[PDB]
């Protein structure tokens, strides 16, 4: 809450966050592009999570190559089932890599 230039931060107990893991890779996959926003190297640091975004096909017209092509895809992430978490409940899942050659 912002009154004048003095912020007042309170603790809202009934608000939720909602999280889901995408196991079918149906979203555009932006990991492995070596962006920032990872865990810090040092365990005691606190970090802010990066914003999600993707960019699709573009196509020419007039002097602008930035027009949207008919096949430009739009993904709504609320169209995925996701788990809604209040402060009490938590979230977990497991994953197993397929066999790859040793480095």
């Amino acid at each position: 809450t912002t009154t004048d230039g003095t912020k007042t931060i309170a603790n809202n107990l009934t608000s939720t966050v909602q999280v889901f893991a995408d196991t079918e890779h149906q979203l555009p996959y932006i990991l492995g592009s070596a962006h920032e926003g990872c865990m810090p190297p040092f365990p005691a640091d606190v970090f802010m999570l990066p914003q999600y975004g993707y960019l699709t096909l573009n196509g020419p017209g007039s002097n602008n190559n930035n027009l949207s092509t008919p096949s430009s895809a739009f993904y709504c992430l609320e169209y995925f089932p996701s788990q809604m978490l209040r402060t009490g409940n938590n979230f977990v899942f497991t994953y197993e890599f397929e066999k790859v050659p040793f480095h």
């Binding site: 079918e24 890779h25 149906q26 979203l27 555009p28 996959y29 008919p70 096949s71 895809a73 739009f74 993904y75 709504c76 169209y79 995925f80």
Partner: protein, 102 residues
């Protein structure tokens, strides 16, 4: 040219009219029989293929390009026979319409 490369492709199928010689001479001759009876043959064939296909699950919100018959009026319908009785193919139809994430 596109397709499925196969080690052991479908077998070639080969057919022939068995030769029927014409009337042989009465005296014996060891040379080949030159003259035959002119004949041909006809009949139906059938081919049955079993195809396996990958179902499509995509959560994109907005609609996709799809193949659609030409929306125009025309003197002759698409992929159809004309007045003279000749079947005419309008469009080579590619297989790639539905989008998929790279």
């Amino acid at each position: 040219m596109g397709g499925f490369g196969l080690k052991n492709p479908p077998p070639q199928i080969l057919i022939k009219n068995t030769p029927v010689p014409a009337d042989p001479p009465t005296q014996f001759s060891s040379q080949k029989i030159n003259s035959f009876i002119t004949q041909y043959s006809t009949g139906q064939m059938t081919v049955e293929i079993e195809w396996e296909l990958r179902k499509e699950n995509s959560k994109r919100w907005n609609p996709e390009i799809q193949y659609t018959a030409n929306f125009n009026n025309s003197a002759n319908a698409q992929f159809s026979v004309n007045n003279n009785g000749l079947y005419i193919e309008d469009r080579t139809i590619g297989t790639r319409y539905l989008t998929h994430t790279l």
